[PDB]
Design a protein around this ligand. Structure first.
Ligand SMILES: [Zn+2]
Ligand SMILES: [Zn+2]
Lengths: 229, 229
């Protein structure tokens, strides 16, 4: 038995990102997996890291330090319920899939805020705390990204550089850091410019990949993988 | 004369980030520059890219596409006023300094949302009209970042890899994309664990750099610079 959380960041259900999220739900459900979706825009998920994230009273209210405050609130069971609700989904999951369009070589801010606020010290990491000592080892993570640019723009000598270059802060600096084994990314290059036939091709690569996702090994989430040889 | 915009992303005025912002204000003010600060947390700046960012009739109300609809809204002058407010600041500035703690090898979500919402098509870039042809050509940008990890940790052989590696989405994918020339980053390493001696020194180093900022030349904002050969 396998549990999957899909963290989904697109405003429009009729989008290509929506299609990809829905075929994931459909295929993983068909397999018998337990599936949960965090539809961040529908949730009006809060992105900002603020003192509202700790309930009651602070470890030092004279000088607010978000990292220390949330670390202490996680230990005293004092985080805001939107955070802890996401933490439970994560804790239960065997696989976390992030489904998003590439905004400025990264995640949309609403999803950045989910990372910033959900992946707190004590839960995902400790200081010291991290990479293999992070707290989500044993779990799989996978970034399913759509891009505005064509594949060849994301080549080494392409204007955008290699797609791997922009994955670093997300796969390594965030997911690896917290202990996830990182599955190879799903990159759906320039679906908006693509034909209905290229778009169906991309959706089926993904449904077909999902059929065998539990047979994948994580990538080696190394600087050599992103930047070499 | 010179105009400077500081986009500042920390919750606590008494923080080290706060110190760095304040010393920038004080030195650039002393020089006679015109200075504006967008204190995003104090502004409760909206980070989410939503349909609330456009006030008129949508171009395609059946299938919402944020990029398309904000592009059209920019041209029609129908974007939300918070966006327009920040666009004016950027338009006027000669130099934009981003002052923030590193969250997940990137900017805090509040600041990611500023990038996502303020730097829209028509304003910051066109297609064509990006990278060296971006619409903010002639302006300078600088990242002033604080880190949890020590300097040794952000080297090629340190735990986090080289600091330049995480700068790529920001410097290249966002600022260079919009036409900015990019000044060398100011990275203040591990202030929380430094002595007050050391913290004072890092503050004073930044103030001293600012004394001669207008004599600096930008980096070559290329793959080679960020990653090597
Ligand atoms: Zn890694
Ligand atoms: Zn560049």
């Amino acid at each position: 038995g396998k549990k999957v959380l899909i963290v989904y960041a697109h405003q429009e259900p009729k989008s290509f990102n929506g299609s990809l999220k829905n075929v994931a739900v459909d295929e993983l459900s068909r397999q018998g997996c337990t599936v949960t979706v965090s539809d961040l825009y529908a949730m009006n998920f809060e992105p900002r890291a603020t003192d509202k994230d700790i309930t009651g009273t602070l470890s030092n209210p004279e000088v607010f330090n978000y990292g220390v405050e949330t670390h202490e609130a996680y230990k005293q069971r004092s985080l805001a319920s939107d955070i802890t609700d996401e933490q439970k989904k994560v804790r239960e999951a065997d696989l976390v899939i992030f489904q998003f369009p590439l905004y400025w070589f990264s995640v949309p801010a609403i999803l950045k805020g989910w990372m910033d606020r959900v992946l707190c010290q004590g839960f995902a990491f400790d200081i010291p705390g991290f990479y293999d000592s992070g707290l989500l080892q044993g779990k799989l993570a996978l970034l399913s990204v759509t891009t505005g640019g064509t594949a060849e723009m994301y080549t080494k000598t392409g204007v955008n550089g290699d797609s791997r270059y922009f994955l670093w802060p997300l796969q390594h600096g965030t997911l690896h850091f917290c202990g996830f084994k990182v599955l190879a990314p799903q990159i759906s290059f320039a679906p908006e410019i693509a034909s209905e036939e290229e778009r169906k091709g991309m959706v089926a690569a993904w449904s077909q990949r999902l059929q065998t996702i539990w047979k994948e090994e994580p990538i080696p989430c190394t600087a050599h993988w992103h930047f070499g040889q």
